[PDB]
Amino acid sequence: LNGTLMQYFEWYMPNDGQHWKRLQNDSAYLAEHGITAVWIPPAYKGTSQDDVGYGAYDLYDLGEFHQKGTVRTKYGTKGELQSAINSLHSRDINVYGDVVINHKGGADATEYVTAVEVDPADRNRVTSGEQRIKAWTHFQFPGRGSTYSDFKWYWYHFDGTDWDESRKLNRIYKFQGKAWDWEVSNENGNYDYLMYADIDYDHPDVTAEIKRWGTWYANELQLDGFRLDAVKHIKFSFLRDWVNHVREKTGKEMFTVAEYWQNDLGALENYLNKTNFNHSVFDVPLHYQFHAASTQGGGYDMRKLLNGTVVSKHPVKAVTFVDNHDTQPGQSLESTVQTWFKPLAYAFILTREAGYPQIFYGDMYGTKGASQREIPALKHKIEPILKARKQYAYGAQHDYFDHHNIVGWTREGDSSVANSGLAALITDGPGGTKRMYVGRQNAGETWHDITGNRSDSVVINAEGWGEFHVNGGSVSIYVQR
Ligand SMILES: C[C@H]1O[C@H](O[C@H]2[C@H](O)[C@@H](O)[C@@H](O[C@H]3[C@H](O)[C@@H](O)[C@@H](O)O[C@@H]3CO)O[C@@H]2CO)[C@H](O)[C@@H](O)[C@@H]1N[C@H]1C=C(CO)[C@@H](O)[C@H](O)[C@H]1O
Ligand SMILES: C[C@H]1O[C@H](O[C@H]2[C@H](O)[C@@H](O)[C@@H](O[C@H]3[C@H](O)[C@@H](O)[C@@H](O)O[C@@H]3CO)O[C@@H]2CO)[C@H](O)[C@@H](O)[C@@H]1N[C@H]1C=C(CO)[C@@H](O)[C@H](O)[C@H]1O
Numbered sequence: 001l002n003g004t005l006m007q008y009f010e011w012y013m014p015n016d017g018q019h020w021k022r023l024q025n026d027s028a029y030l031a032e033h034g035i036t037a038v039w040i041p042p043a044y045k046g047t048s049q050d051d052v053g054y055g056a057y058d059l060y061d062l063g064e065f066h067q068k069g070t071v072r073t074k075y076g077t078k079g080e081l082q083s084a085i086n087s088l089h090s091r092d093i094n095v096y097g098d099v100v101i102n103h104k105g106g107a108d109a110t111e112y113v114t115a116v117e118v119d120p121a122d123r124n125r126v127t128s129g130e131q132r133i134k135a136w137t138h139f140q141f142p143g144r145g146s147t148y149s150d151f152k153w154y155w156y157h158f159d160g161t162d163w164d165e166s167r168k169l170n171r172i173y174k175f176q177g178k179a180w181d182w183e184v185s186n187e188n189g190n191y192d193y194l195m196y197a198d199i200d201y202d203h204p205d206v207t208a209e210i211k212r213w214g215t216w217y218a219n220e221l222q223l224d225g226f227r228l229d230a231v232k233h234i235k236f237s238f239l240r241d242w243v244n245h246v247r248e249k250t251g252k253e254m255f256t257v258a259e260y261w262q263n264d265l266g267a268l269e270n271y272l273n274k275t276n277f278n279h280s281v282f283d284v285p286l287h288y289q290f291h292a293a294s295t296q297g298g299g300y301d302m303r304k305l306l307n308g309t310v311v312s313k314h315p316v317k318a319v320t321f322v323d324n325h326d327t328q329p330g331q332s333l334e335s336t337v338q339t340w341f342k343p344l345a346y347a348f349i350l351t352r353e354a355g356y357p358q359i360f361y362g363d364m365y366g367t368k369g370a371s372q373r374e375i376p377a378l379k380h381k382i383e384p385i386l387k388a389r390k391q392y393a394y395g396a397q398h399d400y401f402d403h404h405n406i407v408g409w410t411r412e413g414d415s416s417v418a419n420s421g422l423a424a425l426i427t428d429g430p431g432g433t434k435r436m437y438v439g440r441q442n443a444g445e446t447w448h449d450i451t452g453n454r455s456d457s458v459v460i461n462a463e464g465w466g467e468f469h470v471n472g473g474s475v476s477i478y479v480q481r
């Protein structure tokens with residue numbers, strides 16, 4: 001009954017073309033552990049075979065055409081992906097496709113383009129006269145031809161680029177007659193430009209094409225929803241319209257979550273307001289609180305976890321998470337939740353009633369970067385918490401955020417899920433005890449810590465209270481034996 005997402009990739013997975021097959025093979029395990037949706041990495045051809053998927057060369061090449069030195073994407077072929085999806089669907093696991101429509105990388109050829117430089121800290125400020133540059137803006141798709149779409153891209157479908165091939169130079173170039181799109185993040189004056197060739201969402205052929213591709217992509221992979229990439233950099237009204245368009249065409253709900261990367265609830269609320277609340281956002285501020293708590297050695301005030309997050313104010317529109325492919329060690333938003341704290345963060349997202357929680361592949365199975373700082377596989381510590389969510393985290397919640405270190409919450413259980421109910425404690429410092437109310441309806445039950453961190457049993461008194469224990473820097477989640 002509780003819904004649980006999984007981001008089914010991390011940055012450093014090996015480029016062996018076996019990921020879709022792995023996902024197919026993991027579908028029974030995922031279903032068994034209560035995963036109800038997976039967010040899959042971008043499924044279309046990037047700038048090379050080892051592209052993680054954000055390069056976005058050809059949105060109509062799902063590992064089907066020999067383009068960029070490969071047929072398969074990093075993850076495998078279209079057919080392998082489709083077989084993975086049909087296995088996931090056979091166990092009622094929904095699939096959300098990653099949508100990378102800010103830009104296009106790896107153009108087939110350059111074009112001579114008139115441009116001006118802009119200031120990278122203030123892209124509204126022009127910093128050169130007009131100059132002739134050689135931009136990677138011509139997309140012909142020679143391996144695909146016109147199969148599925150005859151649409152070709154040229155410089156006038158884009159607002160700019162970050163590379164002039166003639167002078168061999170990295171700056172932000174805005175093309176002649178173009179304007180940065182609005183509304184976008186006001187960071188750096190206007191944050192339309194991010195990388196590669198930036199798509200011009202003022203162009204009516206582009207808006208039409210991307211909407212049409214959206215429907216095609218949904219059909220081709222039988223997607224149940226979307227993860228929207230880089231939404232700070234894409235006209236907000238367009239994103240709103242695109243989501244509405246695909247929903248209208250498919251006739252499906254198409255649950256959507258956007259990645260608006262800002263550690264600021266106000267900025268996220270503005271984005272939600274400008275997209276009419278028609279989709280969810282990742283709870284970026286909550287991720288940063290977990291990171292802060294995990295790095296402050298008990299000095300963090302754990303009461304802070306209740307405030308300043310998307311889940312605290314718009315729980316229906318929050319997708320909560322601990323880490324992702326950008327926050328993992330070595331990556332561009334590095335702010336990793338330290339190993340010791342990571343199960344406590346998972347208890348917070350998985351066993352509390354607010355938010356749509358997401359588990360990270362890198363946390364479950366470890367990350368495969370080349371450092372000695374990789375996330376170890378924490379499957380075995382996360383599994384009991386997943387089970388707590390699947391079987392026990394139902395009914396009315398009571399919060400006990402009344403201490404700098406030891407905080408907890410309870411769930412009374414619901415008569416629709418037999419034996420449901422839980423009492424969770426986490427602490428970023430010394431352990432201890434807390435008396436918490438779990439419901440008079442649970443009076444006399446004997447509860448035990450599903451994580452196995454504590455071996456003691458707790459008998460719920462006549463008044464519906466138990467005395468629950470937690471170890472130092474630990475988590476305990478008590479449920480009925
Ligand atoms: C990879 C990521 O890049 C972009 O994110 C940038 C943020 O927009 C900036 O605001 C800034 O973030 C800082 C925070 O504002 C601040 O709270 C601070 O504590 O640290 C943050 C890191 O400096 O810098 C970010 C990094 O440039 C972009 O907005 C975001 O969407 C990007 N993530 C996705 C996009 C792409 C491109 O398709 C992929 O490379 C990623 O894997 C995606 O997940
Ligand atoms: C999985 C589900 O997550 C989202 O909905 C959940 C909210 O995020 C939670 O906060 C909670 O909502 C309650 C509020 O916390 C509370 O303040 C009060 O307003 O009552 C709310 C309703 O009880 O619980 C919600 C789940 O009931 C998200 O909005 C929703 O779209 C998500 N559902 C999709 C997911 C799956 C599979 O994972 C599909 O089966 C569904 O069809 C999708 O709709």
Ligand SMILES: [Ca+2]
Pocket residue numbers: 102103191192193194198199233234235
């Ligand atoms: Ca853009």
Ligand SMILES: [Ca+2]
Pocket residue numbers: 159178179180181200201202203
């Ligand atoms: Ca524009």
Ligand code: NA
Pocket residue numbers: 159180181192193198199200201
């Ligand atoms: Na643009």
Ligand code: NA
Pocket residue numbers: 298299300301302404405428429
């Ligand atoms: Na603390």
